[PDB]
Enzyme design. Structure first.
Site, PDB file in Angstrom:
ATOM      1  N   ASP A 101       0.836  -1.207   0.000  1.00  0.00           N
ATOM      2  CA  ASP A 101       0.000   0.000   0.000  1.00  0.00           C
ATOM      3  C   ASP A 101       0.876   1.264   0.000  1.00  0.00           C
ATOM      4  OD1 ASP A 101      -3.012   0.933   0.269  1.00  0.00           O
ATOM      5  OD2 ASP A 101      -1.928   2.016   1.865  1.00  0.00           O
ATOM      6  N   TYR A 232      -1.310  11.126   1.675  1.00  0.00           N
ATOM      7  CA  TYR A 232      -2.183  11.377   0.522  1.00  0.00           C
ATOM      8  C   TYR A 232      -2.185  12.852   0.136  1.00  0.00           C
ATOM      9  CZ  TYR A 232      -4.303   6.766   1.366  1.00  0.00           C
ATOM     10  OH  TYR A 232      -4.519   5.418   1.554  1.00  0.00           O
ATOM     11  N   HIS A 297      -7.511  -6.582  -0.278  1.00  0.00           N
ATOM     12  CA  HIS A 297      -6.374  -5.660  -0.196  1.00  0.00           C
ATOM     13  C   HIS A 297      -5.262  -6.039   0.789  1.00  0.00           C
ATOM     14  CE1 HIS A 297      -4.330  -1.722  -0.272  1.00  0.00           C
ATOM     15  NE2 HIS A 297      -4.343  -1.786   1.049  1.00  0.00           N
TER      16      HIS A 297
END
Length: 318
Positions: A101, A232, A297
């Site tokens: 990730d 992010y 995930h």
């Protein structure tokens, strides 16, 4: 787990929590969002038992590692700076890299700036994110999926934190960790709501214990989501700053592994990039890509033993 050593080290101006077990070649594990060193618990135990030195930090902003206050302190360059300092502290020239990730995005940056420090890379979930010179990272996501796409919703400082606060830390973490829905995560307008998973199970899936979830909750309930969210918030800045490496290839040997139901794989034209030739073109020493059927995930946890075995088989080659 009791024999995992936990320490705090000073790297690149911050205090970093490092979990470590074993001796041998270093296998450096980089977790993702919204996780912790603990996401690698099974790999730490397996790889250490199999003769490697497993090292798994909490990244900048996470867990028991320092969380700088400035949003701009979370560019890819800051995080790689921490990790280069860590590798020097470990006393080795090269590591085996394993990442998932956001940790995998940082791992790609590590391989871009210092390929000589990485013998081989097992990359989970997120493949190389090709820098499109025609459009900024988040601008492209916004054009494709709109403003309720999760990465867009993560941009405004404080907003997602408050939305997560309303529903509660345990709910948010269970919501995320239990997701099996493929495709781009689109949030409901104006609140967290169902978030990533409109079909949450009553029981945790069999790969995640009540104690596991409680451990994640114990960190996040205190230190919050801001540090992790800030990664992010630097995606567009990272895009600007990485102009010097436009059109660049990575020569580090890579084994890429994804769950078939991962929202990453099933969105953003990722499947086409991964299998269509683009990924291999950018990463010439990429080996056969592994798609784990009926896995989501969080593949290092859900398919932990398979991940142990893929890591072990790959690094032994070197």
């Amino acid at each position: 787990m009791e024999e995992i050593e936990h320490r705090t080290v000073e790297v690149n101006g911050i205090k970093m929590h490092v979990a470590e077990k074993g001796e041998g070649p270093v296998v450096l594990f980089l977790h993702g969002f919204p996780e912790l060193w603990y996401s690698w618990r099974h790999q730490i135990l397996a790889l250490s038992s199999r003769g490697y030195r497993a090292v798994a930090p909490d990244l900048r902003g996470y867990g028991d590692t320092e969380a700088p206050v400035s949003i701009s302190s979370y560019t890819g360059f800051h995080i790689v700076g921490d990790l280069i300092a860590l590798i020097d502290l470990l006393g080795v020239d090269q590591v085996f890299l394993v990442a998932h990730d956001w940790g995998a995005i940082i791992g790609w940056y590590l391989c871009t700036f210092h390929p000589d420090r990485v013998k081989a890379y097992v990359c989970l979930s997120v493949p190389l994110l090709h820098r499109d010179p025609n459009i900024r990272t988040v601008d492209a996501m916004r054009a494709m999926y709109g403003d309720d796409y999760y990465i867009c919703r993560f941009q405004k400082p404080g907003e997602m934190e408050a939305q997560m606060a309303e529903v509660g830390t345990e709910y948010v973490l269970k919501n995320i960790l239990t997701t099996r829905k493929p495709g781009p995560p689109i949030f409901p307008k104006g609140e967290y709501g169902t978030g990533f998973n409109p079909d949450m199970p009553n029981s945790l899936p069999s790969w995640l214990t009540q104690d596991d979830l409680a451990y994640y909750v114990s960190k996040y309930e205190k230190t919050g989501f801001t540090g992790p969210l800030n990664y992010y918030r630097n995606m567009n800045l990272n895009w600007e700053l990485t102009a010097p490496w436009s059109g660049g290839k990575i020569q580090v040997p890579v084994k890429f592994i994804t769950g078939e139901l991962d929202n990453v794989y099933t969105s953003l034209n990722m499947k086409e990039y991964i299998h269509g030739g683009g990924f291999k073109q950018d990463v010439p020493n990429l080996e056969e890509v592994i798609v784990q059927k009926n896995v989501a995930h969080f593949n290092n946890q859900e398919a932990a033993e398979e991940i142990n075995n893929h890591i072990y088989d790959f690094i032994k080659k070197f």
